[PDB]
Design a protein around this ligand. Structure first.
Ligand SMILES: CC(=O)N[C@H]1NC[C@H](CO)[C@H](O)[C@@H]1O
Ligand SMILES: [Cl-]
Ligand SMILES: [Cl-]
Ligand SMILES: [Cl-]
Length: 499
């Protein structure tokens, strides 16, 4: 009875692990006449409609969303110790009630509810159920405010619908930020009016050659809107001064020798660089950041800064000193890979650490020092949360430069005491980046993202006290029937006792 269990799954069997789980009493059972009661507000009805849409296919039930009556499933906004993202979920014969201070909290409560329901809930056709929800109370709040997932649409382009699909994959685990790597050596993916060739030429191909693609301003706005409806703040990234071949290939003038390099379709990194000693370089950067900021309602703008190996150290520092202010000029908070820690991060900046266990102490120290100086830290170790990294030497996709990363390694660590000497209060959260040098279709993205994706979400959300591999692997194993029913391919790691 893997697909439709006789009894409801345990109230605590969800990922991320909730801050507090108090099981008790009889469960709730959704029946054909169940109504979804919401507050008389746009934001409330929005979450209600979202929930109804998730349940209607598998249940076949009408599930009307109303602001009147005493519905079996109630979403209510009220005061409480749940912050901007927390919630309380009560379940019993009298119904299921999700209470929160804001819509994001109700939304997160819904993500928990879909895991309490049986795997059959993932089907597209009416199923017998039973639609049971374990009885008891869950009180849940997040540990970190920065819980993100990154998708690389530069190495291989993924259209709006494919990005929406990935957004739905991450929404399941309460991630709240979506980092989009919009430009790199193999492609420029956002239309810039002031420099039309970036998209038309720079986005004309991708890794492996052939058609590439890019988002028009309208398409980008739609991705941001969809992400927002899934409570994901979009953090766009235009990498500089390295990983800029797509731009360089589009405009000869940006190159130090005034010659446009060919479009790049390989899989190497570190060979490209904007010309730091040219004035046009800064006009270009200002134009791009300005246009991108205009399309970004979110608070952050990622300028990259990684692997600028063709940029002399002194030029890299000079470049970052000149460009960081441009982000603030357009009203945003700058974010950069941790290499920025070596180029005097501006006040309010955040750096994304992608180092490894083996990283030299001097490098770790530079980042820890930035943290001491007030720079926020986003942790995404390449040998921990890089979803493109192979599980073992036999993984058919992905890379291996950072060694192998099985499920336990990806999960078994504590963000608070990870980077030696770094103040715990400087850690803003975590991120799970999915690079696409080796991935060209949605199914391949799933195979590399799952089952490690839920684990990184837990590190960002759950209390340190709930962290434990032996018990976590059981909660992860329980996801198998849900993913199978949902058509989500995943690596069946031998470290996990799959249900
Ligand atoms: C910050 C960063 O990660 N830069 C590069 N490092 C290796 C990756 C592959 O695992 C991608 O090539 C990525 O663009
Ligand atoms: Cl999904
Ligand atoms: Cl090459
Ligand atoms: Cl390389």
């Amino acid at each position: 009875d893997r697909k439709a269990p006789v009894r409801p799954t345990p109230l605590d069997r969800v990922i991320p692990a909730p801050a507090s789980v108090d099981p008790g009493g009889a469960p709730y059972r959704i029946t054909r006449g169940t109504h979804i009661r919401v507050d008389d507000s746009r934001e409330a009805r929005r979450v209600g409609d979202y929930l109804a849409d998730l349940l209607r296919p598998a249940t076949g039930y009408r599930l009307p969303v109303t602001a009147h009556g005493h519905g079996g499933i109630r979403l209510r906004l009220a005061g409480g110790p749940y912050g901007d993202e927390g919630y309380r979920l009560d379940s019993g014969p009298a119904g299921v009630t999700i209470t929160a201070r804001k819509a994001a909290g109700l939304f997160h409560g819904v993500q928990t509810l879909r895991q309490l329901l049986p795997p059959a809930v993932e089907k597209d056709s009416a199923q017998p159920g039973p639609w049971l929800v374990a009885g008891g109370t869950i009180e849940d709040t997040p540990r970190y405010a920065w819980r993100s997932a990154m998708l690389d649409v530069s190495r291989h382009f993924f259209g709006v619908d494919e990005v929406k699909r990935y957004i739905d994959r991450v929404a399941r685990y309460k991630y709240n930020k979506l980092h989009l790597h919009l430009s790199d050596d193999q492609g420029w993916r956002i239309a810039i009016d002031s420099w039309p060739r970036l998209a038309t030429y720079g986005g004309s191909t991708e890794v492996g050659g052939g058609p590439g693609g890019y988002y028009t301003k309208a398409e980008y706005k739609e991705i941001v809107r969809y992400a927002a409806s899934r409570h994901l703040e979009v953090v766009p990234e235009i990498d500089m001064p390295g990983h800029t071949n797509a731009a360089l290939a589009s405009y000869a003038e940006l190159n130090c020798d005034g010659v446009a390099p060919p479009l790049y379709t390989g899989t190497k990194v570190g060979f490209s660089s904007l010309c730091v000693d040219k004035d046009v370089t800064y006009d270009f950067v200002d134009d791009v950041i300005g246009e991108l900021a205009a399309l970004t309602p979110g608070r952050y703008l990622h300028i990259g800064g990684d692997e600028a190996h063709s940029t002399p150290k002194a030029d890299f520092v000079a470049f970052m000193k000149r460009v960081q202010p441009i982000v603030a000029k357009y009203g945003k908070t700058v974010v950069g890979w941790h290499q920025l820690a070596g180029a005097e991060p501006v006040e309010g900046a955040l750096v994304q650490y992608w180092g490894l266990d083996r990283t030299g102490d001097a490098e770790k120290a530079e980042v820890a020092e930035a943290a001491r100086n007030g720079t926020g830290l986003i942790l995404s170790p390449a040998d921990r949360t890089y979803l493109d990294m192979k599980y073992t030497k036999d993984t058919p996709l992905g890379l291996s430069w950072a060694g192998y990363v099985e499920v336990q390694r990806s999960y078994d660590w504590d963000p608070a005491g990870y980077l030696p000497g770094a103040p715990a209060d400087a850690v803003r959260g975590v991120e799970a980046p999915l690079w696409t040098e080796t991935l060209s279709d949605p199914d391949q993205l799933d195979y590399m993202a799952f089952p490690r994706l839920p684990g990184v979400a837990e590190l960002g959300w759950s209390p340190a006290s709930t962290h434990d591999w032996d018990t976590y692997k059981v909660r992860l194993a329980a996801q198998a029937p849900y993913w199978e029913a949902a058509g989500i391919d995943f690596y069946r790691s031998p470290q996990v006792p799959w249900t």
